[PDB]
């Protein structure tokens, strides 16, 4: 029965119990249920008034932590004689939560999530001699999945007639704005046992509803005579969180952002054949008090 | 205007701050909420579900052989079968559990635990075991005389193929720490040992080696606080195709 | 928006400011308060407990010999036994007291003091002393004629082995300063002297040299203000293993 | 009292005499889609007794070096009976499932089965960074075999798979397990040919062992869809 739990449950005193027909310590794991044996029923207890609050294991508090989701250093200079794969004072980022593994393993403790994303953008700069650090203006334009992303720093997609841009400087506090719950479903699919399209050559595991969009970030300034290395870090805090159907935590190291492929480490712990590091025997106690 | 002054901590970005920020899509109407089965509103719901211990965390136990403990018939009385290190923070049999993984996101913990053992021999296999929890302070008890002086349960196999060993919250103050010192007075939980109470007696057509599966959950007096990152995942490089998100 | 403007003092870090700041652990639930004996809610509770004066702050008094004053039988009448410098700020017999150490965290003080003297001779030892407090303005009185014209108590040894010399708050304005000038009109307290009122008369089997222990506390009209750092501790280097906190 | 059980759906019925108490997944029972959660505006077909009935898959042989078996739903039923014809002729489906798993042996056999229904079991491949293709996921009626069941073939852990709706078949105790699954999706209805929502996993945590005669022990899966709706009528693909 659903009830409101604010502190952990108390303990009642118990006495000697020697009754036939009543075996509270015997259970049936085959039913799929967890044991209902109380501490009052297994050993003889005292009355303990338990005042330990349970508010830090709330799913809101467990998940509303600002975690790093993106990180790009890109050279800020004159790019008239650079390569075809370089970031010419701008970058695009297909928004995911699967690149950095602390937030990934935490979100993948659930099958479905419904949350508002609070995005914090932290820009830092280094001189690529030393003459000082410029207070550069950056534009982070939110391009949805379906629109056109810019191909230049000075392209005309950056005018943002309808795309939401934020204009922020390096000397400012970090730029912060809230992205809503933007899924076409009622919850995001953290795991998607399916294929994204109607033909059989689609991508497995990537629900297109889960992807927020693109995050195109440029430097609005024109180039100086010297070059700079501008590092942009994006931090996401989930909020107003509903979570469904919790999952086993991932034990093996992640291989890719696109799938749940697994290799494991070479030896235990977190290996393919041994998740827990080994001991000598089942009757060997590793940290034994001498 | 209003005379103001800036305090220390102005313009900082604490990653645990709780404020309102600017909406990036004004007048956006979210998708209507649908009833989805299995909603979690507190992570202590998950911690109370039992999950398998890897008591057989030894070499030559490969994969799923680590999840079961093989017991056999013995020719000597009162013999130790296995013991379980109750060190949750250090890598032992309790780490890859639902109670083990969620607690490693926290530094402090409190409350009772329950160990459940399911006997997975034949119907014809009979036996009695004694499952002893020992409070800390001494060594791990190797004989049955020494071990049964603490918290124990004596289990007869049969129609109900499982017992629960409640590991009671027996501690000085309210919480214990997930310290890397397993031998500390504020982190050590104690020991769980299993002995033959009588013996495993099987007939000639049953398999002479039977298995136990050990489960562990937390009770509803269990508590966790002081949230930290988990040691159970890490990276030193980028994941594959993470550069393709920028291309 | 709200039109604001920044005042002088914006962005400063005063170390005595009183503001709210950001919690680093949201929804953290602290350990429940337990009743612990001996709670202090005001430091004037501590200042009212008596503690030993080092009246014997002389060379050849080593360690605990400094905490007692040896008196003997005299062949001349009306003789000075000891005197106590009432300079709390400068290093005298009152510095290492509970009233002395807590007051050196403050600059201004006010209120009465009490000196208690316990006689620690034999039961057979008899005697009378006169404990004279002298208000400031002149020199310290060397003869008993001069000293007894001020605040004094005449003490007979016996079944109650202690007297209290109340040193009254006799000052111009409300407070005195802990100035380094001991001779200032806003810092000098006065003098406490002890004389033989009659003599120490002991028998032949008692020890012919007896001891006094001097105590001092503050009364409940005592007050302290203008908090400053204490001169009683300092450092010029780092402490040992303080580099190990960064390793 | 909780060991005998008869499950009557449609023209089908299953009696079992050594059962456990059956499992309702997340405390939920299957229902039809209500009007305040409906999306598709055309009138759905509800072929009640024609589709809400047990369908029995092919039995798998339960051996010494078995790793485990998995069937993805509704992919294991998209070609069977009138459920499969309604799947192929419609664009949308919505149903719960009643999974009954059968496995019996003698009182001299030992072994334990983790019979677990996994929501949204996105699989992973081993020792590569290429995603699993279409033929590695959509095995159909026959289902697949676990490659590494100790990690559930997705880097997770078999030990913590009891967070999912599950039962056990311990041969000492019972010979059947029953899980009642509701609709488990972020969507009200779904395209059944490109998305699987429940994976039934059946895993040898304790292997089969005896010292009496070696008969074949199979494991049989009977799956009943429950409360089937279908929208978007068209031709069959």
């Amino acid at each position: 029965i659903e009830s409101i739990i604010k502190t952990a449950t108390d303990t009642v005193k118990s006495e000697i119990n020697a009754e036939l027909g009543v075996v509270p310590s015997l259970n049936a794991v085959e039913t799929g249920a967890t044991s209902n044996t109380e501490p009052e029923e297994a050993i003889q207890t005292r009355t303990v008034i338990n005042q330990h609050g349970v508010s830090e294991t709330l799913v809101e508090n467990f998940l509303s932590r600002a975690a790093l989701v993106s990180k790009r250093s890109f050279e800020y200079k004159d790019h008239t004689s650079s390569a075809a794969q370089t970031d010419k004072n701008f970058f695009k980022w297909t928004i995911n939560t699967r690149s950095f593994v602390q937030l990934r393993r935490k979100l993948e403790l659930f099958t479905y999530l419904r949350f508002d994303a609070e995005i914090t953008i932290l820009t830092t700069v280094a001189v690529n001699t030393y003459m000082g650090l410029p207070n550069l203006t950056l534009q982070a334009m939110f391009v949805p999945t379906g629109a056109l992303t810019p191909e230049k720093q000075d392209s005309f997609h950056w005018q943002s007639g309808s795309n939401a841009s934020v204009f922020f400087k390096i000397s400012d506090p970090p730029a912060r704005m809230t992205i809503p719950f933007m899924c076409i479903n009622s919850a995001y699919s953290v795991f998607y046992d399916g294929f994204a399209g109607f033909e059989k050559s689609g991508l497995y595991g990537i629900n297109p509803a889960d992807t927020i969009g693109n995050l195109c970030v440029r430097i609005v300034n024109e180039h100086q005579p010297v070059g700079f290395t501008v590092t942009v870090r994006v931090y996401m805090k989930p909020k107003h969180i509903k979570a469904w159907a919790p999952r086993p935590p991932r034990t093996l190291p992640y291989m890719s952002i696109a799938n749940a492929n697994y290799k494991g480490k070479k030896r235990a712990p977190n290996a393919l054949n041994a998740i827990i590091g080994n001991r000598d025997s089942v009757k060997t106690m590793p940290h034994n008090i001498v | 205007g209003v005379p103001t002054y800036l305090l220390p901590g102005s313009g900082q970005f604490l990653t645990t701050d709780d404020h309102s920020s600017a909406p990036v899509l004004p007048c956006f109407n979210p998708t209507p909420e649908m009833h989805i089965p299995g909603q979690v509103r507190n992570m202590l719901e998950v911690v109370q579900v039992e999950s398998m211990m890897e008591i057989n965390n030894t070499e030559s136990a490969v994969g799923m052989e680590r999840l079961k403990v093989d017991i056999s018939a013995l020719t000597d009385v009162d013999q130790l079968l296995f013991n379980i290190p109750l060190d949750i923070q250090l890598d032992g049999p309790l780490r890859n559990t639902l109670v083990g993984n969620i607690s490693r996101y926290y530094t402090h913990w409190s409350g009772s635990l329950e160990m459940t053992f399911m006997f997975c021999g034949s119907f014809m296999a009979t036996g009695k075991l004694i499952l002893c929890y020992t409070p800390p302070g001494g060594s791990c008890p190797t004989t049955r005389e020494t071990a049964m002086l603490g918290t124990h349960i004596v289990w007869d196999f049969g129609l109900q193929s499982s017992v629960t060993l409640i590991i009671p919250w027996i501690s000085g103050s309210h919480y214990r720490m997930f310290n890397n010192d397993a031998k500390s007075t504020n982190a050590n939980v104690g020991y769980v040992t299993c002995f033959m109470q009588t013996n495993l007696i099987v007939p000639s057509e049953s398999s002479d080696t039977c298995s136990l599966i050990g489960f562990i959950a937390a009770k509803d007096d269990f508590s966790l606080r002081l949230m930290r990152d988990s040691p159970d995942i890490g990276q030193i490089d980028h994941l594959h195709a993470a550069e393709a998100a920028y291309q | 928006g709200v039109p604001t403007y920044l005042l002088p003092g914006s962005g400063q870090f005063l170390t005595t400011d009183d503001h709210s700041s950001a919690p680093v652990l949201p929804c953290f639930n602290p350990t429940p308060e337990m009743h612990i004996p001996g709670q202090v809610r005001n430091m004037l509770e501590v200042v009212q407990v008596e503690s030993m004066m080092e009246i014997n702050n002389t060379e050849s008094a080593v360690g605990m010999e400094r905490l007692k004053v040896d008196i003997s039988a005299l062949t001349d009448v009306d003789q000075l036994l000891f005197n106590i410098p009432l300079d709390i700020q400068l290093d005298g017999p009152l510095r290492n007291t509970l009233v002395g150490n807590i007051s050196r965290y403050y600059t201004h003080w006010s209120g009465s003091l009490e000196m208690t003297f316990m006689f620690c001779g034999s039961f057979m030892a008899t005697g009378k002393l006169i404990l004279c407090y002298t208000p400031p303005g002149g020199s310290c009185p060397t003869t008993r004629e001069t000293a007894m014209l001020g605040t004094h108590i005449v003490w007979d040894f016996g079944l109650q082995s202690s007297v209290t010399l109340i040193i009254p708050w006799i000052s111009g304005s409300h407070y005195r300063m802990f100035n380094n000038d001991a001779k200032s009109t806003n810092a000098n307290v006065g003098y406490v002297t002890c004389f033989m009122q009659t003599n120490l008369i002991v028998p032949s089997e008692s020890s012919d040299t007896c001891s006094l222990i001097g105590f001092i506390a503050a009364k409940d009209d005592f007050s302290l203000r203008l908090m400053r750092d204490s001169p009683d501790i300092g450092q010029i280097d780092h402490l040992h293993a303080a580099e190990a906190a960064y390793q | 009292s909780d060991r005998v059980l008869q499950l009557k759906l449609g023209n089908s019925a299953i009696v079992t005499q050594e059962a456990a108490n059956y499992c309702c997944a997340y405390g939920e029972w299957p229902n039809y889609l209500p009007d305040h959660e409906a999306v598709a505006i055309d009138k759905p077909t509800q072929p009640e007794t024609a589709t809400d009935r047990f369908y029995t898959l092919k039995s798998v042989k339960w051996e010494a070096g078995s790793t485990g078996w998995w069937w993805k739903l509704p992919d294991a039923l998209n070609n069977i009976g009138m459920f499969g014809q309604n799947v192929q002729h419609h664009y949308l489906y919505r149903s719960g499932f009643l999974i009954h798993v059968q496995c019996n042996a003698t009182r001299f056999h030992q072994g334990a089965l983790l019979v677990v229904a996994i929501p949204e079991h996105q699989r992973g491949a081993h020792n590569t960074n290429t995603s699993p293709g279409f033929d590695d996921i959509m095995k159909g009626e026959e289902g697949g075999t676990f490659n590494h069941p100790y990690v559930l073939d997705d880097g997770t852990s078999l030990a913590c798979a009891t967070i999912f709706p599950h039962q056990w078949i311990n041969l000492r105790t019972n010979n059947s397990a029953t899980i009642v699954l509701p609709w488990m999706n972020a969507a009200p209805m779904d395209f059944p040919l490109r998305h699987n929502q429940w994976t039934l996993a059946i895993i040898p945590v304790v292997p089969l062992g005896t010292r009496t005669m070696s008969s074949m022990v199979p494991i049989t899966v009977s799956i009943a869809p429950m409360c089937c709706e279908f929208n978007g009528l068209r031709h069959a693909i």
């Binding site: 709330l58 809230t178 | 309102s20 909406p23 956006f28 998950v46 959950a217 | - | -």
Partner: peptide, 29 residues
């Protein structure tokens, strides 16, 4: 929350309803 959108608000950390029995006792009796 001076913003006009309700998702702009701060984190809602006051949801103390539990139901562990949908995971610990999912049986029908």
């Amino acid at each position: 929350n001076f913003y006009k959108d309700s998702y702009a608000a701060s984190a809602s950390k006051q949801d103390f309803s539990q139901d562990p029995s949908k995971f610990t006792e999912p049986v029908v009796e």
